[PDB]
């Protein structure tokens with residue numbers, strides 16, 4: 001019904017990511033672990049580093065176990081190298097349990113640890129399939145479901161402040177909430193629609209239709225799923241395949257033509273500024289992603305406002321304007337429904353019934369004229385075709 005215990009246990013923003021607190025080893029070594037549903041490794045910093053305020057100190061853990069096996073790991077933008085082992089892990093603000101899970105002690109890394117982010121590790125919530133080195137390194141959530149009773153399911157509620165926050169605010173703020181082994185009704189409104197999980201590797205879903213201000217982008221759906229479509233809390237923007245992305249931008253551009261912006265902006269690089277609280281939320285279009293449903297020939301949709309795709313950043317010269325960056329970029333690796341999009345809903349990663357939940361988050365940013373949404377059902381056909389093989 002509601003797990004008040006775990007509510008608000010997240011912290012951060014779509015920028016650097018939303019992390020949760022965990023203790024590694026004996027005695028407990030508190031560490032803020034970045035919540036990433038797009039990976040499967042549990043890797044914490046295990047050495048001193050420019051951007052780490054504290055790290056994993058095996059020499060001091062009485063239960064640390066060496067596996068004399070290393071691990072290299074590349075990321076769409078980054079990569080770390082570490083030494084595989086095991087230790088006792090616990091989630092302070094989570095189910096009351098202690099589980100032994102594989103911990104990849106990051107000993108060397110390039111462009112991975114974000115400066116200021118405030119998290120020293122990453123929790124790969126995905127499936128073995130994508131784990132490194134091989135699919136035999138039992139992801140953490142599995143160890144958890146195997147060693148305890150905790151239902152095999154977790155939900156996510158990421159909250160974007162809607163405005164830029166300073167490192168002080170981040171710390172003393174409620175990024176979001178990750179409910180371990182349950183669904184807390186207080187985090188969402190409306191019904192909760194479900195889309196099937198294609199293959200249990202990444203958290204893969206299938207998109208069947210895409211609209212901009214209601215105008216069907218009208219593309220062969222496969223293109224939307226080109227390569228694959230995933231729900232990855234570790235990615236910030238809404239990554240879209242070139243052919244699509246390009247169509248999307250042509251639309252978003254056209255719908256906001258009353259105002260023109262530099263190419264830089266549309267290419268997610270530079271920001272756009274507006275006088276304090278005068279941002280034209282209304283001249284920008286809403287994006288509606290149609291996801292496959294569980295009932296044959298039936299689909300539902302999620303709709304986001306520009307308060308989701310226009311990412312808040314600090315003023316060019318930290319003043320009084322309100323600025324953002326277009327947060328939709330092309331992807332050579334398919335579609336990535338990242339942090340932003342997620343910020344618009346309460347997602348139930350129900351691994352058990354192999355399906356992902358989507359509800360309107362009780363904490364998504366909006367105005368009094370438009371609200372995000374999860375509406376359904378819709379009679380569409382041959383959606384299995386939208387799939388990519």
Ligand SMILES: CC(C)C[C@H](NC(=O)[C@@H]1CC(=O)NCCCCCCOC(=O)N[C@@H](C(C)C)C(=O)N1)[C@@H](O)C[C@@H](C)C(=O)N[C@H](C(=O)NCc1ccccc1)C(C)C
Nearest residue numbers: 038039040074075076077078112130234235236237239338
């Ligand atoms: C802390 C951070 C480094 C975590 C990773 N995030 C990333 O790599 C994200 C992906 C993305 O599209 N974000 C959209 C916002 C763009 C903003 C503009 C700036 O973006 C950037 O240039 N870089 C970063 C930011 C955070 C600094 C970033 O955003 N990269 C994580 O999500 C990793 C995922 C995406 C990943 O790549 N997982 C592996 C994978 O899928 N690998 C496939 C592969 C195999 C062989 C070669 C290449 C890839 C898996 C095995 C663990």
